[PDB]
Structure 1
Amino acid sequence: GIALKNVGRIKKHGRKHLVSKNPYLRLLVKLYNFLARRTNANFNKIIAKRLIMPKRYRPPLSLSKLQYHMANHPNDIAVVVGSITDDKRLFSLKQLKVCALRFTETARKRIEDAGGECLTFDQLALKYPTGKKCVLLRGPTKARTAEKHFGKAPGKPKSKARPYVRSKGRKFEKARGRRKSRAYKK
């Protein structure tokens, strides 16, 4: 015998392969695995990892937030591993160069009308092999509604979690345990 933990074997804690079956995505995975291996650049490793993640870890990015992130980076390229969407709250748009996995129709029209362009990842592999003058960006990953129920249970003192309820009103879970007048508040 011998006194090891998890005997002599090393633990890893994440996703290892694609689950999706889109042939084009499989070709992309092959390409960026090759690029990551043969030029250890830390730019292609991260991209090779990000396009393996599940849907909830590839959130969309709005046009306005993308323009805000690129304000001090003229004539550079923004790289997103998600979709980018339109934003009616903006009045005007600048000229931008953006590579993303998907664009919506309105966002694609607005970008090209200002003189910009939209890129796929196989073109970025051909023009910026090691990511020179490229900026990696992510969207908000904890803005989903499901994350509002996680954390401390609703009922523990000073929590912020939403409850699961049929509907909302004065008759739906507002009496005992949420006000001092019925025996205690939270």
Structure 2
Amino acid sequence: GIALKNVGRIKKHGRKHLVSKNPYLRLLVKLYNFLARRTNANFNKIIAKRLIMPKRYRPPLSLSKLQYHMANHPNDIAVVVGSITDDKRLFSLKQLKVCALRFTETARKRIEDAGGECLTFDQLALKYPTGKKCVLLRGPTKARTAEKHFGKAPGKPKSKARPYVRSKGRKFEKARGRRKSRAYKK
């Protein structure tokens, strides 16, 4: 015999190929995997890896946030491995150049009206081979409401995890065990 960690079989973690059965998405992963394998550019590998990612991980991105990111180099092209969503807080938009997976209908209309450019990934690959003069961006990821129930358990000291409740009124989980007055505090 011999002694090795997991008997000499290496354990990689995360995805192994896309789960999605969508033909267009299958076509895109084939294309970017090919670009990744041939070129040595890190841009191609990261785009390929991010493209495979499940639904929760790639978030929706607001236009306003995208403008804030592009602000100090507005000559160049933002790529975003998710969907871009529109915003009513954003007053106006200064003609950005954006590659995204999916556009909300209103956002595309606004960007086009502003004189900007909406790119699909196939188009991005065709125009830009190595991500030259590009900026990879992605949105708030941990900010998803579900994750607020994760981490060091609710009601274990200081920890800020949301409980789960039927409703958030005064008779539900707000008496014994959450304040000085009635047993121990939070």
TM-score by length of 2: 0.98
CA distance in 2, matches of 1:17, 1:137: 22
Which structure 1 residue ranges, 4+ long, deviate > 4 Å from structure 2? none
SS at match of 2:28: helix
* Per-residue Cα deviation, 1:67-107 (whole angstroms, up to 9, x for no partner): 00000112100000111111101111111110100001110
CA distance in 1, matches of 2:49, 2:126: 19
SS at match of 1:51: helix
Whether 2:108 is the aligned partner of 1:108: answer yes
* Per-residue Cα deviation, 1:126-179 (whole angstroms, up to 9, x for no partner): 111111100000101111110010011111011101111111111111111111
CA distance in 2, matches of 1:63, 1:174: 39
Aligned residues: CA RMSD: 0.8
Deviates most, 43-52 or 8-17: 8-17
SS at match of 2:56: helix
Deviation, structure 1 residue 6: 1.0
TM-score by length of 1: 0.98
CA distance in 2, matches of 1:74, 1:152: 41
CA distance in 1, matches of 2:176, 2:118: 55
SS at match of 1:156: coil
CA distance in 1, matches of 2:149, 2:135: 33
* Per-residue Cα deviation, 1:19-73 (whole angstroms, up to 9, x for no partner): 1111011111111111001111001000011110000111011010000000011
Identity of aligned residues (%): 100
Number of aligned residues? 186
Deviation, structure 1 residue 3: 2.0
Whether 2:94 is the aligned partner of 1:94: answer yes
Unpaired stretches in structure 2, ≥5 consecutive residues:
none
CA distance in 2, matches of 1:114, 1:2: 66
